[PDB]
Protein backbone atom coordinates (compact mmCIF):
# COMPACT_ATOMS: atom_id res chain seq x y z
CA UNK A 1 0.00 0.00 0.00
CA UNK A 2 3.09 2.23 0.00
CA UNK A 3 4.62 3.18 -3.35
CA UNK A 4 7.84 1.26 -4.09
CA UNK A 5 10.61 3.06 -6.00
CA UNK A 6 13.60 1.36 -7.58
CA UNK A 7 16.46 3.85 -7.32
CA UNK A 8 19.39 2.84 -9.51
CA UNK A 9 22.91 4.15 -8.81
CA UNK A 10 25.19 4.18 -11.87
CA UNK A 11 28.59 5.65 -12.71
CA UNK A 12 32.18 4.62 -13.43
CA UNK A 13 34.17 2.23 -11.23
CA UNK A 14 35.44 3.79 -8.01
CA UNK A 15 33.32 6.99 -8.03
CA UNK A 16 31.68 6.07 -4.70
CA UNK A 17 28.29 4.55 -5.62
CA UNK A 18 28.66 1.94 -2.89
CA UNK A 19 30.02 4.40 -0.31
CA UNK A 20 27.05 6.69 -0.93
CA UNK A 21 24.58 3.81 -0.69
CA UNK A 22 26.18 2.47 2.49
CA UNK A 23 26.14 5.93 4.13
CA UNK A 24 22.46 6.17 3.16
CA UNK A 25 21.57 2.78 4.71
CA UNK A 26 24.10 2.21 7.49
CA UNK A 27 25.40 5.73 8.29
CA UNK A 28 29.02 4.55 8.04
CA UNK A 29 31.83 5.30 5.59
CA UNK A 30 33.63 2.41 3.90
CA UNK A 31 37.33 3.09 3.26
CA UNK A 32 38.07 -0.14 1.35
CA UNK A 33 37.46 -0.38 -2.38
CA UNK A 34 35.65 -3.64 -3.03
CA UNK A 35 34.15 -3.65 -6.54
CA UNK A 36 30.40 -4.27 -6.91
CA UNK A 37 28.68 -6.61 -9.34
CA UNK A 38 25.14 -5.83 -8.13
CA UNK A 39 23.58 -5.22 -4.72
CA UNK A 40 20.06 -4.19 -3.71
CA UNK A 41 19.04 -2.59 -0.40
CA UNK A 42 15.52 -1.91 0.90
CA UNK A 43 14.14 0.58 3.45
CA UNK A 44 10.81 2.13 4.39
CA UNK A 45 11.22 5.88 4.69
CA UNK A 46 9.23 9.07 5.06
CA UNK A 47 9.99 11.98 2.75
CA UNK A 48 7.92 15.20 3.00
CA UNK A 49 5.32 13.45 5.23
CA UNK A 50 4.84 10.63 2.69
CA UNK A 51 6.06 7.08 3.19
CA UNK A 52 7.61 4.93 0.48
CA UNK A 53 9.59 1.73 0.10
CA UNK A 54 12.98 2.37 -1.50
CA UNK A 55 14.81 -0.42 -3.27
CA UNK A 56 18.26 1.00 -4.06
CA UNK A 57 20.17 -0.87 -6.78
CA UNK A 58 23.92 -0.35 -6.47
CA UNK A 59 25.45 -1.27 -9.85
CA UNK A 60 28.87 -2.23 -11.18
CA UNK A 61 31.06 0.54 -12.52
CA UNK A 62 33.56 -2.06 -13.83
CA UNK A 63 32.90 -2.36 -17.57
CA UNK A 64 33.25 -6.17 -17.52
CA UNK A 65 29.86 -6.35 -15.76
CA UNK A 66 28.09 -3.99 -18.18
CA UNK A 67 25.71 -6.63 -19.65
CA UNK A 68 24.32 -7.50 -16.22
CA UNK A 69 24.12 -3.81 -15.21
CA UNK A 70 22.03 -2.97 -18.30
CA UNK A 71 19.49 -5.65 -17.33
CA UNK A 72 19.18 -4.35 -13.73
CA UNK A 73 18.87 -0.76 -15.07
CA UNK A 74 15.77 -1.71 -17.11
CA UNK A 75 13.81 -1.98 -13.86
CA UNK A 76 14.68 1.55 -12.61
CA UNK A 77 12.17 4.24 -11.57
CA UNK A 78 14.94 6.82 -11.26
CA UNK A 79 18.73 7.13 -11.52
CA UNK A 80 21.68 8.75 -9.80
CA UNK A 81 24.44 9.33 -12.32
CA UNK A 82 27.47 9.57 -10.04
CA UNK A 83 30.96 10.78 -10.98
CA UNK A 84 33.99 11.63 -8.87
CA UNK A 85 35.17 15.25 -8.94
CA UNK A 86 38.71 13.81 -8.64
CA UNK A 87 38.28 11.60 -11.73
CA UNK A 88 37.92 13.50 -15.03
CA UNK A 89 37.17 10.34 -17.05
CA UNK A 90 34.17 9.53 -14.81
CA UNK A 91 32.81 13.01 -15.53
CA UNK A 92 33.34 12.60 -19.28
CA UNK A 93 31.44 9.26 -19.11
CA UNK A 94 28.27 11.00 -17.82
CA UNK A 95 27.06 11.22 -21.47
CA UNK A 96 27.44 7.45 -21.96
CA UNK A 97 25.36 6.92 -18.78
CA UNK A 98 22.75 9.52 -19.83
CA UNK A 99 22.42 7.90 -23.31
CA UNK A 100 22.22 4.44 -21.73
CA UNK A 101 19.41 5.32 -19.31
CA UNK A 102 17.26 6.83 -22.06
CA UNK A 103 17.87 3.80 -24.29
CA UNK A 104 17.06 1.19 -21.61
CA UNK A 105 13.93 3.10 -20.50
CA UNK A 106 13.03 3.94 -24.13
CA UNK A 107 12.19 7.56 -23.36
CA UNK A 108 13.36 11.05 -24.26
CA UNK A 109 13.65 12.05 -20.58
CA UNK A 110 13.59 10.15 -17.27
CA UNK A 111 13.97 10.90 -13.53
CA UNK A 112 17.69 11.33 -12.84
CA UNK A 113 20.08 13.45 -10.82
CA UNK A 114 23.69 14.22 -11.65
CA UNK A 115 25.77 13.56 -8.52
CA UNK A 116 29.27 15.01 -8.13
CA UNK A 117 30.89 12.92 -5.42
CA UNK A 118 34.14 13.13 -3.36
CA UNK A 119 34.01 16.92 -2.88
CA UNK A 120 35.74 16.50 0.50
CA UNK A 121 38.92 15.93 -1.54
CA UNK A 122 39.36 19.66 -2.23
CA UNK A 123 43.11 19.35 -2.90
CA UNK A 124 42.58 16.61 -5.51
CA UNK A 125 39.51 18.07 -7.25
CA UNK A 126 39.68 18.24 -11.07
CA UNK A 127 36.09 18.92 -12.14
CA UNK A 128 34.71 22.32 -11.04
CA UNK A 129 31.22 23.02 -9.67
CA UNK A 130 30.60 25.18 -12.76
CA UNK A 131 31.52 22.28 -15.08
CA UNK A 132 29.23 19.92 -13.21
CA UNK A 133 26.29 22.33 -13.20
CA UNK A 134 26.80 22.99 -16.95
CA UNK A 135 26.73 19.22 -17.67
CA UNK A 136 23.52 18.81 -15.64
CA UNK A 137 21.91 21.83 -17.31
CA UNK A 138 22.73 20.41 -20.78
CA UNK A 139 20.46 17.48 -19.91
CA UNK A 140 17.89 19.55 -17.97
CA UNK A 141 18.45 17.47 -14.82
CA UNK A 142 19.27 18.44 -11.20
CA UNK A 143 22.81 18.75 -9.92
CA UNK A 144 24.06 18.00 -6.40
CA UNK A 145 27.47 17.66 -4.72
CA UNK A 146 28.14 14.87 -2.22
CA UNK A 147 30.69 13.24 0.04
CA UNK A 148 30.28 9.79 1.53
CA UNK A 149 33.21 10.41 3.93
CA UNK A 150 32.38 11.41 7.51
CA UNK A 151 30.84 13.84 8.06
CA UNK A 152 28.71 12.99 4.97
CA UNK A 153 27.47 15.76 2.69
CA UNK A 154 24.04 15.61 1.00
CA UNK A 155 23.79 11.81 1.07
CA UNK A 156 20.23 11.42 2.44
CA UNK A 157 19.24 14.55 0.50
CA UNK A 158 20.39 13.07 -2.83
CA UNK A 159 18.31 9.91 -2.43
CA UNK A 160 15.31 11.89 -1.10
CA UNK A 161 15.64 14.37 -3.99
CA UNK A 162 15.54 11.51 -6.50
CA UNK A 163 12.27 10.40 -4.88
CA UNK A 164 10.99 14.02 -5.12
CA UNK A 165 11.84 13.98 -8.88
CA UNK A 166 10.03 10.62 -9.38
CA UNK A 167 7.00 12.06 -7.52
CA UNK A 168 6.80 14.78 -10.23
CA UNK A 169 5.92 12.03 -12.77
N1 LIG B 1 37.36 10.77 0.23
C1 LIG B 1 36.33 10.07 -0.30
N2 LIG B 1 36.51 8.81 -0.67
C2 LIG B 1 35.38 8.24 -1.18
C3 LIG B 1 34.13 8.81 -1.34
N3 LIG B 1 33.24 7.90 -1.90
C4 LIG B 1 33.94 6.82 -2.06
N4 LIG B 1 35.25 6.95 -1.63
C5 LIG B 1 36.31 5.94 -1.67
O1 LIG B 1 36.53 5.59 -3.03
C6 LIG B 1 36.75 4.18 -3.17
C7 LIG B 1 35.69 3.60 -4.10
O2 LIG B 1 34.39 3.69 -3.48
P1 LIG B 1 33.24 2.71 -3.91
O3 LIG B 1 32.07 3.18 -3.13
O4 LIG B 1 33.70 1.32 -3.73
O5 LIG B 1 33.08 2.95 -5.44
P2 LIG B 1 32.08 2.30 -6.44
O6 LIG B 1 31.65 3.37 -7.35
O7 LIG B 1 31.00 1.60 -5.68
N5 LIG B 1 32.92 1.18 -7.25
P3 LIG B 1 32.38 -0.08 -8.12
O8 LIG B 1 31.81 0.56 -9.36
O9 LIG B 1 33.55 -0.88 -8.60
O10 LIG B 1 31.46 -0.88 -7.25
C8 LIG B 1 36.75 3.62 -1.75
O11 LIG B 1 38.10 3.62 -1.30
C9 LIG B 1 35.96 4.65 -0.94
O12 LIG B 1 36.36 4.73 0.43
C10 LIG B 1 33.96 10.17 -0.95
O13 LIG B 1 32.95 10.86 -1.01
N6 LIG B 1 35.13 10.73 -0.42
MG1 LIG C 1 30.42 -0.35 -5.68
Amino acid sequence: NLPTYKLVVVGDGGVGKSALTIQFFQKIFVDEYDPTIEDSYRKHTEIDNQWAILDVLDTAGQEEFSAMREQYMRTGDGFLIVYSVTDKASFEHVDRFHQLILRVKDRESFPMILVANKVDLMHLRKVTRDQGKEMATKYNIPYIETSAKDPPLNVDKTFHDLVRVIRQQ
Side-chain angles (χ1 to χ4, degrees):
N1 51 253
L2 293 186
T4 296
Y5 307 115
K6 285 190 142 197
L7 310 183
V8 187
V9 190
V10 305
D12 274 8
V15 299
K17 302 181 295 300
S18 296
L20 287 166
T21 299
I22 294 164
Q23 267 289 6
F24 186 54
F25 282 87
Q26 291 185 56
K27 302 184 203 299
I28 72 178
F29 176 59
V30 293
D31 189 70
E32 304 74 26
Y33 179 26
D34 290 343
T36 307
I37 296 177
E38 174 75 8
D39 288 277
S40 187
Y41 304 92
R42 167 168 279 207
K43 70 206 281 197
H44 287 60
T45 203
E46 178 178 23
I47 301 152
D48 304 331
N49 299 95
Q50 293 171 23
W51 286 86
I53 301 161
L54 306 188
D55 288 309
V56 171
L57 283 60
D58 178 25
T59 69
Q62 289 281 316
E63 203 58 19
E64 66 263 29
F65 302 113
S66 67
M68 293 126 288
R69 173 182 66 201
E70 177 166 328
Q71 292 310 119
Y72 291 119
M73 285 177 75
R74 294 179 74 167
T75 69
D77 296 307
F79 296 88
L80 296 179
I81 302 176
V82 184
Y83 65 97
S84 169
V85 301
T86 68
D87 179 359
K88 199 175 299 83
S90 73
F91 176 63
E92 292 169 342
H93 293 148
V94 168
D95 188 62
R96 210 280 262 83
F97 285 108
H98 186 267
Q99 309 182 354
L100 181 56
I101 289 162
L102 294 188
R103 179 170 74 68
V104 305
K105 300 307 298 191
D106 192 48
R107 268 172 59 187
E108 285 200 321
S109 61
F110 200 78
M112 64 183 75
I113 290 177
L114 183 58
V115 179
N117 193 46
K118 303 202 187 182
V119 302
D120 56 285
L121 296 178
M122 295 180 77
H123 308 283
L124 298 174
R125 182 163 185 170
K126 300 290 196 172
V127 184
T128 67
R129 173 175 265 281
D130 282 0
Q131 283 181 281
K133 193 53 184 301
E134 179 182 66
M135 177 74 78
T137 299
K138 184 167 81 193
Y139 298 118
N140 286 317
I141 62 177
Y143 172 77
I144 194 163
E145 300 194 348
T146 60
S147 172
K149 181 166 185 144
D150 189 79
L153 176 66
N154 286 335
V155 176
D156 288 342
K157 172 162 170 60
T158 294
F159 282 97
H160 295 164
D161 278 349
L162 183 55
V163 175
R164 295 178 176 112
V165 174
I166 294 173
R167 286 168 175 181
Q168 296 290 107
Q169 293 290 280

